[PDB]
């Protein structure tokens, strides 16, 4: 019984102790573990979207599933506890949210588009930020002007158009900001 036979797993921005735990448990579960992001990788466990590995998956690997750090610890525990494991192997439950760790602020966008954007941000696992603070990862700007725009630039926050959001949602992964500049 190798529940994860055929699974090839790679990790990105994972704590050393947790990554060692994941490599061990995934191997015991029957998966192939990869240190480097090799061609045969089927699943990428990610702790952040700001890594060459995550950026490669988002840009060039739409066949791979981007997973939460909890997937392997949770599935392994369930397995060794004698709990029942379905055909799913808790993949759907532990899929990393599309906008994982995104803190999205808006400027110069009117209503009802502002409400629409907020709802899609929350739906796809992001944090909606009415106020611009230095912890905002993305500022969706309607025009390249105003106080939010000026401070986001000073605070080195990504200033993107709304297509960053819509293309990230369609890809089901965080995409890079350089293609969505105003």
């Amino acid at each position: 019984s190798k529940p994860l036979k055929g699974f090839v797993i790679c990790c990105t921005s994972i704590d050393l102790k947790q990554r060692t735990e994941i490599s061990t448990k995934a191997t015991k579960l029957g998966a192939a573990y990869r240190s480097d992001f090799t061609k045969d990788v089927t699943h990428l466990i990610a702790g952040d979207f700001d890594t060459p590995k995550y950026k490669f998956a988002a840009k060039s690997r739409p066949d791979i599933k981007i997973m939460s750090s909890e997937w392997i610890p949770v599935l392994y525990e369930s397995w060794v506890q004698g709990e029942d494991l379905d055909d799913g192997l808790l993949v759907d439950k532990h899929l990393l949210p599309t906008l994982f760790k995104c803190r999205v602020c808006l400027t110069n966008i009117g209503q009802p588009e502002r409400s629409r954007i907020e709802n899609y941000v929350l739906k796809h696992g992001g944090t909606f930020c009415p106020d611009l603070t230095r912890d905002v990862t993305h500022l969706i700007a309607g025009t390249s002007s105003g106080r939010k725009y000026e401070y986001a630039l000073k605070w080195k926050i990504n200033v993107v158009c709304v297509e960053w959001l819509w293309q990230s949602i369609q890809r089901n992964a965080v995409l890079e900001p350089q293609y969505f500049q105003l």
């Binding site: 966008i109 209503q111 106020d131 611009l132 309607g142 025009t143």
Partner: peptide
């Protein structure tokens, strides 16, 4: 606010 640019009031939205 300090390190903060508050949300634009609805009446001032384009």
């Amino acid at each position: 606010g300090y390190g903060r640019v508050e949300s634009t009031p609805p009446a001032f939205l384009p």
